[PDB]
């Protein structure tokens, strides 16, 4: 009856001979 | 009485799937040759080619934007087509309604011309006849021949006008008879128009309508006449006695046997007398109002 | 060019502007071309527009409009090829990619994607949040 | 600014229903809870029992009682109520 | 206070009811009864 | 396949309502029209009292009689079948 709707890049490189001691 | 029994609640909300997975920790270990052995289960792969793709993605996005612009233009064209369709439908509906109204007005005018129940229709018909006579007289004057016989032409036109007036008068007489019948019916309806007096008036109106009924059965008419005679004898006045005598005469004729066409006039007489008696304060208390 | 093409062009011109001026402005020229079923990029639309929006009349009269539109319609393109290209361009093999990333790539690559157009397309497609829409299914839904 | 597409109730009842709807919307968040509160308030004031439907998009087609069915839209949702 | 056009009451005419206590006003048409459709504002 | 969110009725009645909803959905493709067809079918099938609601975002709490309540989801729409 009703109708409705609705943080920066970092570069680190080991240098040649930096960490190694020859003697 | 009554009381609440029970109830249930259920809401249909939207639902969706989900996907949850924890992170994965991996460790890559290298070893010196012979210091630590590592199981080998790796798979070799081809070199491959990597490319650049930015230009291809840009071209694809340009094509996609072109298609999107085409779709937007299609939507605009669809809106325009909907507006045009609505305008055309409105114009067609208005034209059809205007044509129907004009046809109804023409039909009403034709019906008024054929049967001028309205006094306005009768006046319009008389005015139209007068205008036609004036046009005929103007045509005769324009012709302007046989001045001696111009009187004869005028006499012929007068005879035609007299015939038309006689036809109009006959139509008016028929309309007047119909209007008198309609006025009697409307007065009867208004009298029956709740109170006990209104109920009595309604019963009297029902009896009168039954008396004035077409193609009624002989037995039904006799029973209605007997009921009306009983109602009249309830009042038992002088006019009531005369009406009862007339009703008894009609019933005796019907029982003796004859064509109802032979007694239709007497039946109309009895109906008129009964209506006149009913339209009295004694028969109907509401008769004071009318 | 032909009778049917002229009727289609008249329908597109009426959709762009039905005032009866007999000409279509440069702003609505792109809309008319889009309603004609063509899919030209923004650069090509500008190329077609400025190639008739110089004479000073403020619009393209009937003859120039019809000849230019016939020249434009002489070209042909395939929507299936574009759909396959988009399916391949989708990063995942199945064609399921992030809507935000795809919209950003489209806006920042080549012809910039309009924000309103992208939002309308996304709303029409209604991609699933739980699982990214496959390329073929998204193409079918869009067209 | 309000809207009521279709309703069947007294003028005072409609005003009371409108006032109740605003109070329910102000004092409730769940649509079903607001509908239940409105239904209970209507039932306690308009000859219980009755029922109501709350949602966002739904076509309605039912046969309610005479002068026992109202419908209106407020805020973001639409409210349809009718006595069972 | 109800002010507006009526046709023997319950008429689908422009009418406004001013609920002073609530401070609101409802304007609409009392179509074949007390009310069928209208809009309520806070005056 | 249709999933019944809630149902209080006979299994045959529930199956009959499901068949009516599927037939109405195949025939009527409008939310108001499908509900009207479903309501008409439901009234003629089980009992004169019927109540069919069609929608996708309609969640309501309304009292319903026993053995005369159903709420099922078919496809993407939500169907609520009951007796008024």
PDB file of N, CA and C in Angstrom, chain B residues 35 76 97 167 189 209:
ATOM      1  N   UNK B  35      86.633 -23.393   5.632  1.00  0.00           N
ATOM      2  CA  UNK B  35      86.374 -22.981   7.009  1.00  0.00           C
ATOM      3  C   UNK B  35      85.006 -23.471   7.466  1.00  0.00           C
ATOM      4  N   UNK B  76      28.685  13.201 -21.225  1.00  0.00           N
ATOM      5  CA  UNK B  76      28.072  14.480 -21.573  1.00  0.00           C
ATOM      6  C   UNK B  76      27.032  14.309 -22.675  1.00  0.00           C
ATOM      7  N   UNK B  97      -2.226  16.176 -24.803  1.00  0.00           N
ATOM      8  CA  UNK B  97      -3.201  16.703 -23.857  1.00  0.00           C
ATOM      9  C   UNK B  97      -4.005  17.844 -24.469  1.00  0.00           C
ATOM     10  N   UNK B 167     -38.691  23.584 -34.662  1.00  0.00           N
ATOM     11  CA  UNK B 167     -37.818  22.489 -34.247  1.00  0.00           C
ATOM     12  C   UNK B 167     -37.105  22.819 -32.939  1.00  0.00           C
ATOM     13  N   UNK B 189     -34.159  12.960  -3.835  1.00  0.00           N
ATOM     14  CA  UNK B 189     -32.859  12.643  -3.249  1.00  0.00           C
ATOM     15  C   UNK B 189     -32.531  13.571  -2.084  1.00  0.00           C
ATOM     16  N   UNK B 209     -39.128   5.034  -5.823  1.00  0.00           N
ATOM     17  CA  UNK B 209     -38.273   4.557  -6.905  1.00  0.00           C
ATOM     18  C   UNK B 209     -38.705   3.175  -7.377  1.00  0.00           C
TER      19      UNK B 209
END
